[PDB]
Enzyme design. Structure first.
Site, mmCIF file in Angstrom:
data_model
loop_
_atom_site.group_PDB
_atom_site.id
_atom_site.type_symbol
_atom_site.label_atom_id
_atom_site.label_comp_id
_atom_site.label_asym_id
_atom_site.label_seq_id
_atom_site.Cartn_x
_atom_site.Cartn_y
_atom_site.Cartn_z
ATOM 1 N N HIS A 75 2.159 15.932 15.871
ATOM 2 C CA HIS A 75 2.031 14.454 15.850
ATOM 3 C C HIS A 75 1.896 13.863 14.511
ATOM 4 O O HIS A 75 0.996 14.246 13.605
ATOM 5 C CB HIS A 75 1.017 14.261 16.616
ATOM 6 C CG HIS A 75 1.034 14.678 18.135
ATOM 7 N ND1 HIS A 75 2.108 14.359 18.916
ATOM 8 C CD2 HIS A 75 0.728 16.039 18.684
ATOM 9 C CE1 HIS A 75 2.216 14.929 20.033
ATOM 10 N NE2 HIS A 75 1.416 15.910 20.040
ATOM 11 N N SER B 14 -6.048 8.480 5.041
ATOM 12 C CA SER B 14 -5.536 7.034 5.240
ATOM 13 C C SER B 14 -4.174 6.818 4.251
ATOM 14 O O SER B 14 -4.096 7.418 3.165
ATOM 15 C CB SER B 14 -6.466 6.081 4.708
ATOM 16 O OG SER B 14 -6.255 4.753 4.786
ATOM 17 N N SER C 18 0.704 -1.280 0.098
ATOM 18 C CA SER C 18 -0.018 -0.107 0.164
ATOM 19 C C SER C 18 1.053 1.339 -0.067
ATOM 20 O O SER C 18 0.266 2.663 -0.303
ATOM 21 C CB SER C 18 -0.797 0.119 1.098
ATOM 22 O OG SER C 18 -0.214 -0.030 2.310
ATOM 23 N N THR D 257 12.823 -0.983 -48.280
ATOM 24 C CA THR D 257 11.590 -1.779 -47.716
ATOM 25 C C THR D 257 12.122 -3.255 -47.737
ATOM 26 O O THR D 257 13.051 -3.708 -48.437
ATOM 27 C CB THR D 257 10.423 -1.830 -48.719
ATOM 28 O OG1 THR D 257 10.865 -2.390 -49.868
ATOM 29 C CG2 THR D 257 9.965 -0.208 -48.792
ATOM 30 N N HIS D 258 11.912 -3.803 -46.754
ATOM 31 C CA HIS D 258 12.417 -5.186 -46.239
ATOM 32 C C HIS D 258 13.966 -5.269 -46.255
ATOM 33 O O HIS D 258 14.534 -6.373 -46.385
ATOM 34 C CB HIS D 258 12.146 -5.995 -47.461
ATOM 35 C CG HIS D 258 10.537 -6.480 -47.789
ATOM 36 N ND1 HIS D 258 9.572 -7.213 -47.232
ATOM 37 C CD2 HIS D 258 9.959 -5.676 -48.615
ATOM 38 C CE1 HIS D 258 8.422 -7.007 -47.795
ATOM 39 N NE2 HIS D 258 8.533 -6.122 -48.639
ATOM 40 N N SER E 150 40.424 7.103 -31.305
ATOM 41 C CA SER E 150 41.835 6.784 -31.944
ATOM 42 C C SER E 150 41.849 7.503 -33.151
ATOM 43 O O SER E 150 41.294 7.489 -34.026
ATOM 44 C CB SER E 150 41.812 5.007 -32.277
ATOM 45 O OG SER E 150 41.268 4.278 -31.240
ATOM 46 N N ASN F 275 0.509 11.162 13.262
ATOM 47 C CA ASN F 275 -1.004 10.440 12.699
ATOM 48 C C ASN F 275 -1.930 11.601 13.078
ATOM 49 O O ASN F 275 -2.808 11.939 12.112
ATOM 50 C CB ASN F 275 -0.951 9.283 13.674
ATOM 51 C CG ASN F 275 -2.489 8.653 13.066
ATOM 52 O OD1 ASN F 275 -2.541 8.358 11.952
ATOM 53 N ND2 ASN F 275 -3.453 8.553 13.964
ATOM 54 N N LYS G 26 35.094 6.470 -36.956
ATOM 55 C CA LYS G 26 34.973 5.294 -36.183
ATOM 56 C C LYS G 26 34.258 5.350 -35.018
ATOM 57 O O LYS G 26 34.429 4.573 -33.992
ATOM 58 C CB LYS G 26 36.142 4.258 -36.203
ATOM 59 C CG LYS G 26 35.996 3.000 -36.137
ATOM 60 C CD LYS G 26 37.089 2.331 -35.472
ATOM 61 C CE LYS G 26 36.846 0.816 -35.670
ATOM 62 N NZ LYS G 26 36.289 0.068 -34.658
ATOM 63 N N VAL G 27 33.508 6.440 -34.832
ATOM 64 C CA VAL G 27 32.772 6.896 -33.632
ATOM 65 C C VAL G 27 31.421 6.310 -33.451
ATOM 66 O O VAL G 27 30.798 6.530 -34.526
ATOM 67 C CB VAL G 27 32.747 8.533 -33.334
ATOM 68 C CG1 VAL G 27 32.082 8.837 -31.987
ATOM 69 C CG2 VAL G 27 34.040 8.905 -33.236
ATOM 70 N N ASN H 150 -4.405 4.125 2.729
ATOM 71 C CA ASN H 150 -4.993 3.793 1.209
ATOM 72 C C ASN H 150 -5.118 4.963 0.421
ATOM 73 O O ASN H 150 -5.071 4.587 -0.888
ATOM 74 C CB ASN H 150 -6.112 3.051 1.687
ATOM 75 C CG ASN H 150 -5.641 1.937 2.606
ATOM 76 O OD1 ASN H 150 -4.521 1.610 3.022
ATOM 77 N ND2 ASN H 150 -6.890 0.860 3.204
ATOM 78 N N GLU I 217 22.333 4.312 -29.054
ATOM 79 C CA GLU I 217 22.379 3.070 -28.167
ATOM 80 C C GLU I 217 21.748 3.480 -27.132
ATOM 81 O O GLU I 217 21.079 2.466 -26.303
ATOM 82 C CB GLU I 217 23.864 2.800 -28.285
ATOM 83 C CG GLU I 217 24.319 2.120 -29.357
ATOM 84 C CD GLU I 217 25.985 2.205 -29.489
ATOM 85 O OE1 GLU I 217 26.562 2.314 -28.489
ATOM 86 O OE2 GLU I 217 26.551 1.578 -30.372
#
Lengths: 461, 461, 459, 459
Positions: B129, B139, B98, B187-188, B317, B131, B323-324, B141, B330
């Site tokens: 206090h 509540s 709950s 496509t495909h 490098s 409560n 080559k990055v 709930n 990702e």
């Protein structure tokens, strides 16, 4: 700390906090992936440190790294393993999909710290170098998958399996203790043929024993390590003995049966071992969900549920006795749902490799190690705060048994099926106990009913 | 801090750290649910503080709480909202289902702090206090589901929707900028009829616009608040105006259209609004996965992939130009997998209510708020570190177009289908361009080919 | 055109030309949900279970020889495909599978009666409950049939097709062991490897998956039969459970055993949750393999194009080479299906209560579907695609030699800085590495040809 | 017994008694995967799409009146159930749905030829591609059929059944508005509410679900037709897209519109991913409602037993009242299925590339199955369970009055500490609250009856 230190990589210079040990590549990742709050877990950081420690030892054995540097790297890695550098690993799960940035985080922290251990300084005048020394003989492509499997295998062996065995032992003790307590069966949620409370708990025990076997079957594949495959799996630019030597060294220092992966292309291009091992974990989650639900339903009450067992009451109204929630059962059912979702995320990442490298790795290991923590700690918590204290409510168990219609079959051998069925039908229609209906029809005496209707004779052995 | 303070609840006394503001019920939860590392997120803590602030204001309006206490509770809640008490909320996600324990964590921290603000002390001599004052008219709930919806609606309105709109605007700018750049269709995964780069990007834009509408459709249900249903939905023990008044006050202080739930039984017994809203989020994850994949595949190279676009290079490098890795793509694809798994965990929790209360709530909100952070921050990151800098590689786009077999249809009106098909077949069989095959057969001149084969006439408007 | 059959609720009209009875007819009126029915594999496993139960009951003296033999004969007719239209019930029925248990009891009783010279209907000589269901409960029969169907399907369909596809790819890996191609990591050009090495990764994946599937078989081989209503075996002969498992092992030639704990066997679907874990692993591996194949074959001109695959569908004559990688598409689609099926199974398996899991029809529907999809998908992908994979050697060499990746071979001969300068110049000016090297005057054409050897860069 | 049909790959034997052609026959040989085929709803939506395409082509002067009318007549025969056995292809086919598009093109062409006095086969008077597929691509036809099938199934099956079940439960909530019962939170006894209030929660759930489903309909109503191969509409009349959407709206009486962005329409299944999100929401709500019903009905003696439900299955005469809540079991099982189907759909929807999503047969197979399951499940649960829910008033009152929860009614009359002492004594000594109060001498029996009023505790 406001003051900065300038760190360099092939891209140029970038400022890092002067009181931190990481370098330029860690800083760039930190700044470019400000995504949510999930970071690498401690288990994975430790596995990366173990991998670097073993790599340094083997490089020294092979004459590729000096003794002075290898010992300094080992010392720095041991400081990480001892919990001295947790704040030196600031990177997100949601980074590059190879985990390269966390590989570099470890390379940079270990190099800067090893430099200090050799009497030098952190930063660009360091005496130990992240790529040339700490990453010698390695690629991010083979280091990160290695750390994934090291973390996963150690977590399964050292946390999950021991807690599973402990919970299984507790429930086996309870099954033996309650072996003679007959209770009503429930099938389809409806009253059913009786069985003992010990028999019912023995089902939970057998579930946990089967789960242990399934988890054990998944360990040999997780024990295969990618290290030595280098960039694409061929091992180009590494000593031909490096792969086996580093797996052997990891096996020595962890006391776990690590071996080099027989096919480095499978090891780099997939997360298949973890997809399969997590299959066993989602099986355990489904078993634990069922056990936890049985416990909370059987304990439900105090007066308007089932109430056949009591469980420890761990959190606090004095006006409401018997009104404490089955909170361990709730935590456990919640984390079982989490493991099911984690399995889907892992499956999608594992299905999504391309060519020589799977680049969904931080996400896969984030989910996998989380499921292990949840299942291990959840079983530990449920055991100590609930299972060890399960007790029968013997009077309630007997009340339900005796007020049920299910014991009527004990009458068949004495008075015949037709009269027994007449009794059950009358009891059901008129809201009577079986005994009251049988006496009302005049088919037996109270002494006969008490002699003939014996639940302890209706459960086999 | 080693020194302790003794705090009490109906169960007895328990030691809490002397330098902390929580009380006995928080300490018991902390000690009994040592499960993994996931805690309530800051957004949820803030939503709980907002709920208590609004509850105190309404209790004061109704004459149920003194002005002095209501103002002190408001001040304490504002300190939480200002980030001054993040370390006062130590509880796990994997707690009571709950969220009662986190409700009490806020009650205890606000009471102890409000006491200090009134010149008193923390602990059992406090002047406010947990409560009787901080939880007055409430509540667990109804409080926890209220905080769930407050956190969810504000996160969607203030983080996710603005980042979605920003990314959509960037891609719309790119679509307009590249509206005249013809490229090969796919496509495909196979070469296909051409379209412009702007047209292709316009599909991404339309996806994001549709997703915004679906997310907007989910907001009215999340805006319904359980507060005022009390324990089981009847509102027993609450002023008849409390439910509407507190929803109005939350609407005022958050500038969001919160309303009281028209059916408090649905509001307590289910997490249906979040199951539905997360359905829209997993739709966004599927769209973002596709966009991110298109970007990284179109940028793939530098020489052995597609290479039709370039993207910003953010991490190093020097021996390997071009080559990055597409690291933003990702991170984004990884978090999209996470959202899919999170949806399964949410669905299981949402399907698992019983009777008057769903007790899978911490897990549901943990997953929901995580998905919002991932999608919002992921779109923010992908936009600023990738999308704003997408550029065509015009020479490569044209090379692929001109070396393809797809432009052959431009010949049909001039030389007829049969000769055009003969040209395409010869080019395919012999490894020639369409132009070289057509010249080899003698069916046209080079000037005719250049005049007739016009990709800019093959994409509509 | 109808006859009147009866159960405890009264009489109900049943089609005269059908062999089911009153309870099956009632199910048809109360569970009219969608179109999914019990698959043939499960119907056959139910018939095998009843055949074995009848044999053991005869051995124990509980069922007459003439009745037991007639029941076995009727079950054999089901197994021989003579009664496919006698099992009309939906998956979406009672969660214990009681209705399908009764469907088999009624069909076998009515047919066995005819085999004994009697008739179908209420005058039958063999009785669905007292004879065909003797010593049994729906609670233990249905999970027994689930495990019989699952184990036989894994042994007879899935594992053979997995081995067949693995052997094909292993042959391709050997055939292409010396063909050097560009690596790809993060989708970017990368260090070289051979096509044979790349395919060996697919092979190793399939070999690992076979082991994981094999590890799941012992638990599936455990049978609930003999636990009766709640697991205690009340009212059942003490030897029944072992004897029926033994008889099922005899007639199927598979290593069925009685479940050592009948409470786990009745209260859970745990063996199938675990076994399906291995199947979703295989789905993730097949997804990756199928994607590699279609991406490596992509083209004909604007993709990768390193391999060729068979073309099984027609296309327009003006579009040579455009044909789609349709086997890869069917396979990736069914792999998504297996992932979804795993979630449905996990929810059902997590949802047992007390003595019985009542999510069983749904669990077995998903499990057997996944087995069909993976077995048939591997057969189709093998026959219509994998056996025909071939390298495009000229394209492979063009991509490899025109890339920037072979520049590392120069580091040992000239400077690393000279090698880096060559790569930067080639990339900046759109040159090959060789052309950029000759322009800088850092080597001769003979030196480049001697030094840059891709075949020496794959170890 | 066979005829020879041809495509660009050559000749192939086709059963003489079937209406498909060469391409359908090839698919049957290359996609022999499992048993799932296109559902009737999708076949009908494909026929409607071809009917509308033929009408618009005629309007535009691109197709002769006699051919367009014959195509429409053949499509109407499909819609009228005359050709169910002419669509044999698997779900697990080409990912664009090309093969099923060609199945419809071939069946309609061969049948239209017969309607024009011709024959089926290569001498046909109507042609699958040049006539039946005119102005179309598989790439835009299949997603159009997907959305036509999905929108019509939601409007005609699911939404009506949802409204019907909601109305039943709303009637029950009113009928039981004054029956006070014990609340349950955490499975523990809790503050009271009426049975009508508890059922009103189920009603409000179903009302909210209806709104969420309605919000998903506008996106599903957007049609891809007219985008042709890649979304540009190349080679298609500029009015075709709007005209065909208009014609589909006319003939179906549903608000179909042309998709404003054809690239989104071809490259994604986003509308169905989103619409299925609302369906898995409904599955989670129905799971909860079904579980409440079976738990509240549990018994006959050892559960909760607060409500009674219809008993639809027979049982042994010695076991009165034992009958299982089988409608609840079928419903909870299908709700698990919808959750798994959502995962399969999400993976397919996330997996488009460039101009086309090629996971379409799998996506629509799952989507239409979920609609059938939820629509038929709600119909079955309504007719065979919900309409017959009744309170067990004596049991409800027994649980309520014997619980400890009504003690709060004493706080205003006696001390809260006295009320707490009463509850603690009752719990400790197994007493009712009234008996414990009288034993302590804290009130009279008249005072308890006057003060402890459950009907005053539900506001």
């Amino acid at each position: 700390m406001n003051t900065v230190r300038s760190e360099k990589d092939s891209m140029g210079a970038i400022d890092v906090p002067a009181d931190k040990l990481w370098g330029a590549q860690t800083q760039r990742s930190l700044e470019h992936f400000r995504i949510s709050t999930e970071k690498m877990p401690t288990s994975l950081i430790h596995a990366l440190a173990l991998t670097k420690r073993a790599a340094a030892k083997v490089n020294e054995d092979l004459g590729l790294l000096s003794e002075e540097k290898a010992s300094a790297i080992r010392q720095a890695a041991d400081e990480v393993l001892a919990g001295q550098h947790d704040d030196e690993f600031p990177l997100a799960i949601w980074q590059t999909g190879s985990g390269t940035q966390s590989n570099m985080n470890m390379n940079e922290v270990l190099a800067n710290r090893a430099s200090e251990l050799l009497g030098g300084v952190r930063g660009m005048e360091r005496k130990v170098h992240p790529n040339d020394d700490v990453n010698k003989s390695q690629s991010s492509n083979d280091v990160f998958p290695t750390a994934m499997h090291v973390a996963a295998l150690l977590a399964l062996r050292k946390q999950l399996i021991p807690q599973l065995k402990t919970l299984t032992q507790t429930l086996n003790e309870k099954s033996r203790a309650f072996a003679d307590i007959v209770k009503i069966g429930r099938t389809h949620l409806q009253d059913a043929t009786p069985l003992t409370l010990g028999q019912e708990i023995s089902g939970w025990v057998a579930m946990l024993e089967h789960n242990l076997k399934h988890i054990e079957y998944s360990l040999p594949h997780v024990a295969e390590l990618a290290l030595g495959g280098t960039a694409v799996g061929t091992g180009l630019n590494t000593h031909p003995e490096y792969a086996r030597r580093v797996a052997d060294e990891l096996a020595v220092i962890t006391c776990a049966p690590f071996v080099t992966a027989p096919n480095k292309f499978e090891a780099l291009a997939t997360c298949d071992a973890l997809v399969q091992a997590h299959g066993a974990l989602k099986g355990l989650a489904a078993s634990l969900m069922k056990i936890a639900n049985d416990v909370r339903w059987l304990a439900s009450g105090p007066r308007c549920g089932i109430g056949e067992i009591s469980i420890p009451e761990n959190e606090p109204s004095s006006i409401m006795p018997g009104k404490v929630a089955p909170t361990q059962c709730e935590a456990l059912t919640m984390l079982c749902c989490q493991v099911m979702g984690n399995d889907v995320a892992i499956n999608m990442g594992g299905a999504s490799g391309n060519f020589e490298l799977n680049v969904f790795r931080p996400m896969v290991i984030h989910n996998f190690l989380q499921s292990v923590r949840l299942l291990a700690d959840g079983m530990e918590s449920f055991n100590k705060h609930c299972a060890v204290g399960i007790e029968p409510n013997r009077e309630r168990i007997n009340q339900l048994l005796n007020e049920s219609l299910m014991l009527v079959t004990a009458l068949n051998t004495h008075i015949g099926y037709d009269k027994a069925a007449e009794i059950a039908k009358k009891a059901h229609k008129e809201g009577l106990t079986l005994k009251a209906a049988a006496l009302a029809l005049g088919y037996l005496s109270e002494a006969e009913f008490d002699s003939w209707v014996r639940p302890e004779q209706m459960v086999g052995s």
